[PDB]
């Protein structure tokens, strides 16, 4: 066997939270970061990372070994084709609904329950001023994944751990971009930083993350 972090009979005692679908794993590919939480304590026990391909693989296994029991539906493949903020926001919510339903099924067959347990017991992620994954556009205007670090009153953006942008907040102005009506770029949870000029369009994965980032800007 491979060591199990949570026994299949104890799937009911955990909550899941899909934290991101822009996480860079050990091989530096975009993957899905998932947190496993103890229900009674509310403490985050561990995190793990899976590519969308691995997610569909386990899904394929389940459809075939439990055909008679209803199972949730994965996000569509089109949500992972052209990178846009509105798709990133949506597919994270569907994945949250998906894995909440999985660990809410009362009983799985012994083989299927072990496979799910092995799934969450691999690709473990250990992670210990504001930061987070961001989506960046410039005024021929595609989006690109960036990792933002707020240093003092200066924002730093990295592309695969390489400084590609550096921003002064004292020189710049900030404004929210309304989610609606949806523009021709799929902007969502977005805001504009105009550094004195130059304009950077930045979106977060959730609307809460936009709230948290603006407060860091203050």
Numbering used by the authors: 502 to 629, 636 to 646, 652 to 708, 716 to 737
What did the paper state?
In this study, we have determined the X-ray crystallographic structure of the interesting tandem PX-PH domain module of Bem3 to a resolution of 2.2 Å, showing that the putative membrane-binding regions of both domains are oriented in the same direction and thus might act synergistically in membrane recognition and binding. The crystal structure of the tandem PX-PH domains shows the well characterized folds of both protein domains. The model contains amino acids 502–629 belonging to the PX domain and 636–737 of the PH domain, but the linker region (amino acids 630–635) between the domains as well as the loops between β1PH and β2PH (amino acids 647–651) and β6PH and β7PH (amino acids 709–715) within the PH domain were flexible and could not be resolved. Even though six amino acids are missing between the two domains, the presented structural assembly within the asymmetric unit represents the only possible arrangement, and a different connectivity between the PX and PH domains is excluded because the positions of the respective C- and N-termini are too remote. Strikingly, the PX domain of Bem3 contains basic residues (for example Lys551 and Arg592/Lys593) at similar positions compared with other PX domains, which have previously been termed basic motifs I and II, respectively, and have been shown to be involved in PIP binding. Specific point mutations introduced at this position in Slm1 and the PH domain of EFA6 resulted in mislocalization of the respective proteins, further signifying the role of this arginine in ligand binding. In line with these findings, an analysis involving the mutation of basic residues within the β1PH–β2PH loop of yeast Bem3 (R644S, R645S and K647D) showed that this abolished binding of the PH domain to PIP2, rendering the protein incapable of correctly localizing to the polar site at the cell membrane. In contrast to these mutations within the PH domain, a quadruple mutant involving amino acids within the so-called ‘membrane-interaction loop’ of the PX domain exhibits wild-type localization of Bem3. Although the critical residues Lys551 and Arg592 of basic motifs I and II of the Bem3 PX domain are conserved in the majority of PX domains, their role in the direct binding of PIPs has yet to be elucidated. The structure shows that the putative lipid-binding domains adopt a relative orientation that enables them to simultaneously bind to a membrane.
